Amino acid sequence: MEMEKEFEQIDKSGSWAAIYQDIRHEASDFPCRVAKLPKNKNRNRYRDVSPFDHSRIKLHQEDNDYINASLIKMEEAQRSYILTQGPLPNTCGHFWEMVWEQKSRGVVMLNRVMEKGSLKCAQYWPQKEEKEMIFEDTNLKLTLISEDIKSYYTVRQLELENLTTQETREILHFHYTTWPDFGVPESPASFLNFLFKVRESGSLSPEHGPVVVHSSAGIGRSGTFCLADTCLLLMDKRKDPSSVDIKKVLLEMRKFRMGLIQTADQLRFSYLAVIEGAKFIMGDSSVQDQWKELSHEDL
């Protein structure tokens, strides 16, 4: 097929809501029996957003191995991501336990702790160097080493320490602070500038465990981020970029976690980001600098 031509035909006819509902109708439905067990009721932020049993991340905990998190394993693209909900007050220890156990190097946060007067996620990382956090239930320590604040995103260097063994690991936290719930980024440039910062950090490298991506539910903004990244990888990977079918890729991702991409506009935005990102993939290396300037991260 031809991605760019497809985008124009859908956009000109204003048919995004149509294709999006088709995706919702065609999406996989698998059991989430573990997530629904009463004992895990308080481990879920939302009653309607649960990980499928087949792809859920298991804590190496003998007590209760449940966490609302899913392993999105993209075979052809050769990349895996863990999408999870924003940690709750009682699951912050579980979250970092998962990060440790899965050997993740980066955490991508797409929501804000407070969104329009409502808390979408617990303050699960230290805000100050001198006030480290200790998660007693999972025996982990977390310290803020440094932070680089930009206009619409912040990158933080954290030190995670397994208190049992005393081993320590550097975790990179990429916080997109201006992506509204059920909304889209300011521009493909802002989004791509952020994605490439994550990519360049080395966090998405196959030598590390899967990057952990979350929003409030771990499906809308999270799905948008992963879909774009995966489509860009497939584009760079195969013979013909135009061959990448964004809808087919999204349906594949939905086999691993329900509701990835929550609005038709998020779907539309995904196309925009992949189309613009493809410029860099085909050869234009200068575009990367254009995105950066267009993003106004210095502001």
């Binding site: 932020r45 939302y46 009653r47 309607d48 957003v49 409502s118 059920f182 409030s216 539910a217 499906i219 509701g259 929550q262």
Partner: peptide, 7 residues
């Protein structure tokens, strides 16, 4: 607040 999906 308990439900995230918008009808």
């Amino acid at each position: 607040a308990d439900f995230y999906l918008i009808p």
